């Protein structure tokens, strides 16, 4: 079997990863969990086994068949190409590499193909991108993508177990103490990074990640242009809003698309129903689509509120749901590692392609 | 002075049509406070006058010169012809009347004139497409529109003061007992008059009204209709999605538009910062933006995240904020009412149009 290593195991995506590994059909020899300083000494489970936190270094990947990184764009910056020079292939959940033309960004569903060149590095996508390629590429592969506009419900687990309990304490100081939301502290949302922050109890936070200097946040911009690269087509206009809402877990979509010929609807959800990954969930006779709540802890993606442009021929609306942390994080890496595992490319590169840091 | 009947002044409108009413220009000579059998002979304020609540009837008109309705539609419908019969100025906050040619549909800033025409009542639009207008008709008066795409982000407040309850309850149970948001038990939301209820804690539901036949909802049925009836243009393209989200109060809205001529980005700024009832928030730099939270308790409608598309040349994107029971209904009732006032409109019609049930 296997050596692997989750980079970040302590973390919101960590935990999940961890989860996702323990259910995964992957075989595992050993795991070895890694975090900062901080965490270095404290005991995890693996199943019923109890695992030893190490600090992540550069000399801390030998031995290692796969790593898992979710530990922020700048572990993976600084560690992943010393993983890949120890002949790791690493599956990485940030944003860092994502754009480098040498790593394969990949939904498994939709361009495991990309794989077969890889040069180390995977790089998972945007969780909020995910969910969209998963349900739209079964749209396109029939019918075609002109453009897509869409408006995103995004959970706190997103940024982090901070964001989490940030997020609960307001509620309970609004609930329980009286305070008015606009009166609440906040440290962390809308985005850690960034020199303001703002209450998300009972509240909408238009500002998912910092700002670009086109008006449009990382996050937004993030979800352009990692469509193109998903599904290798440039020509694909894709404009996003990305709102952070008083949800723990699972994102949710308000997605708008125009085909490029007329896709009729019932047959689009037959093809959505037939695509893997996606499972189509409208019958609004019985009031019947995703709904967040639901969706927590399936790695299933949900789609349903599918119907015609009121007026544009080719236009389509629908409402698309999953966990953030598992297809938009932990599941799409470990079913990454599992589709590495499967097409015989789990090994050592040849060359390096990235600058030690 | 006026004699003004508030009916439905029990509920979640009515309390601010109260402090509205309390806070406005209209000189009143009288107060009377309709609602159902439930409340007749309770008592409520006016400033510190306490009134006996009365019973609405097909009698409880007489004497009134101006009634503001919110007590739903079947309530209006039943008893707004009786309130006109009997020469009463109805402002209703409804959807019953608002398709009717014989009623002006109207937001003061956008189609005040519209007022002139009135053959007893005026109805006020759904508050989701009145806080749209007032962002967009600042642009339509100078670049024209061709099509709204519009997903909403709706406060629990708009479905009235049980669903405002359901919710804090239902995060009580989350936060402070422990129970899963799955495991909830609601009644009320996403719709009480539909057959079956889910959880809005943790959760966002993209259902607010029932099902229209199209399988758009009313509520996203409303704000293109409304939106075309307001703008006296029926070439506007407009479908929307519309979803109940966590928020106590004020409504957010993603809106996206195709503007007639190209409207340069920063004059589009000026031009809603210029229109009375709209406040431009957007400085992305300091990450000002218009946020539910702090909107609440205002009479103004917040815009910002203002941004061309990336790709449609005529395309624009913008979030749009406002307190979904002022401007959205109690606020812009009242507005309604100090126009007719201003304008010498508050007199009895002499022609019935509607029909008495
Ligand atoms: N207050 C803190 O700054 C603090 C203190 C202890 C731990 N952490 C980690 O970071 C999280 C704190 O809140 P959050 O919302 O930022 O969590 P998060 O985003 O949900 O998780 C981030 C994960 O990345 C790891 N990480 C962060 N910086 C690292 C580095 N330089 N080298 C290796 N691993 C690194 C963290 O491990 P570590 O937990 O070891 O950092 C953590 O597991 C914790 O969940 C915890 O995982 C943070
Ligand atoms: N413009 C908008 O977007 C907008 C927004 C919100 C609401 N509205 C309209 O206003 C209505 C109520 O809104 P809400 O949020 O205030 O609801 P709510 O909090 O549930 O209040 C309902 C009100 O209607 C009264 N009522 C119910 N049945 C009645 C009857 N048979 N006769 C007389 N009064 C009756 C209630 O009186 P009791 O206390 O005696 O039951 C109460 O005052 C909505 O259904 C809608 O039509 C419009
Ligand atoms: O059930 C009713 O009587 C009306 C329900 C309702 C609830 C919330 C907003 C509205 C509205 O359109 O403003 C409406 C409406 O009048 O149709
Ligand atoms: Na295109
Ligand atoms: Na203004
Ligand atoms: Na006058």
Same mark, same amino acid.
């Given at each position: 079997?296997?050596?692997?290593?989750?980079?970040?195991?302590?973390?919101?995506?960590?935990?999940?990863?961890?989860?996702?590994?323990?259910?995964?059909?992957?075989?595992?020899?050993?795991?070895?969990?890694? !975090?900062?300083?901080?965490?270095?000494?404290?005991?995890?489970?693996?199943?019923?086994?109890?695992?030893?936190?190490?600090?992540?270094?550069?000399?801390?990947?030998?031995?290692?068949? =796969?790593?898992?990184?979710?530990? $922020?764009?700048?572990?993976? !910056?600084?560690?992943?190409?010393?993983?890949?020079?120890?002949?790791?292939?690493?599956?990485?959940?940030?944003?860092?590499?994502?754009?480098?033309?040498?790593?394969?960004?990949?939904?498994?569903?939709?361009?495991?193909?990309?794989?077969?060149?890889?040069?180390?590095?995977?790089? *998972?996508?945007? *969780?909020?991108?995910?969910?969209?390629?998963?349900?739209?590429?079964?749209?396109?592969?029939?019918?075609?993508?002109?453009?897509?506009?869409?408006?995103?419900?995004?959970?706190?687990?997103?940024?982090?177990?901070?964001?989490?309990?940030?997020?609960?304490?307001?509620?309970?100081?609004?609930?329980?103490?009286?305070?008015?939301?606009?009166?609440?502290?906040?440290?962390?949302?809308?985005?850690?990074?960034?020199?303001?922050?703002?209450? =998300?109890?009972?509240?909408?936070?238009?500002? =998912?990640?910092?700002?670009?200097?086109?008006?449009?946040?990382?996050?937004?911009?993030?979800?352009?242009?990692?469509? +193109?690269?998903?599904?290798?087509?440039?020509?694909?206009?894709?404009? !996003?809003? *990305?709102?952070?809402?008083?949800?723990?877990?699972?994102?949710?979509?308000?997605?708008?698309?125009?085909? +490029?010929?007329?896709?009729? =609807?019932?047959?689009?959800?037959?093809?959505?129903? !037939?695509?893997?990954?996606?499972?189509?969930?409208?019958?609004?006779?019985?009031?019947?689509?995703?709904?967040? /709540?639901?969706?927590?802890?399936?790695?299933?993606?949900?789609? $349903?509120? /599918?119907?015609?442009?009121?007026?544009?021929?080719?236009?389509?609306?629908?409402?698309?749901?999953?966990?953030?942390?598992?297809?938009?994080?932990?599941?799409?890496?470990?079913?990454?590692?599992?589709?590495?595992?499967?097409?015989?490319?789990?090994?050592?590169?040849?060359?390096?392609?990235?600058?030690?840091?």
């Amino acid at each position: 079997g296997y050596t692997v290593a989750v980079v970040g195991a302590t973390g919101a995506v960590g935990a999940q990863m961890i989860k996702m590994l323990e259910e995964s059909t992957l075989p595992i020899d050993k795991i070895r969990y890694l !975090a900062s300083a901080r965490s270095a000494g404290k005991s995890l489970k693996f199943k019923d086994q109890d695992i030893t936190i190490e600090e992540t270094t550069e000399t801390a990947f030998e031995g290692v068949d =796969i790593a898992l990184f979710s530990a $922020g764009s700048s572990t993976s !910056a600084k560690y992943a190409p010393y993983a890949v020079k120890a002949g790791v292939v690493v599956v990485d959940n940030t944003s860092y590499f994502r754009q480098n033309p040498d790593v394969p960004l990949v939904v498994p569903e939709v361009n495991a193909h990309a794989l077969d060149a890889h040069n180390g590095i995977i790089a *998972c996508p945007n *969780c909020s991108t995910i969910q969209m390629m998963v349900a739209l590429e079964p749209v396109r592969q029939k019918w075609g993508l002109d453009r897509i506009i869409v408006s995103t419900y995004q959970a706190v687990s997103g940024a982090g177990m901070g964001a989490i309990l940030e997020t609960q304490r307001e509620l309970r100081e609004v609930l329980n103490d009286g305070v008015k939301p606009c009166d609440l502290h906040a440290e962390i949302l809308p985005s850690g990074g960034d020199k303001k922050h703002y209450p =998300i109890a009972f509240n909408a936070l238009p500002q =998912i990640d910092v700002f670009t200097d086109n008006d449009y946040t990382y996050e937004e911009m993030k979800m352009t242009k990692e469509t +193109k690269k998903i599904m290798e087509d440039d020509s694909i206009a894709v404009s !996003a809003t *990305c709102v952070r809402i008083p949800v723990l877990s699972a994102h949710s979509e308000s997605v708008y698309i125009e085909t +490029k010929e007329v896709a009729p =609807i019932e047959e689009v959800k037959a093809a959505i129903a !037939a695509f893997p990954g996606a499972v189509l969930e409208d019958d609004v006779a019985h009031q019947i689509y995703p709904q967040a /709540i639901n969706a927590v802890g399936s790695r299933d993606t949900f789609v $349903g509120r /599918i119907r015609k442009d009121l007026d544009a021929e080719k236009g389509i609306h629908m409402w698309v749901v999953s966990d953030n942390l598992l297809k938009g994080a932990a599941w799409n890496s470990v079913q990454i590692a599992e589709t590495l595992h499967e097409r015989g490319l789990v090994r050592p590169t040849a060359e390096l392609k990235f600058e030690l840091k």
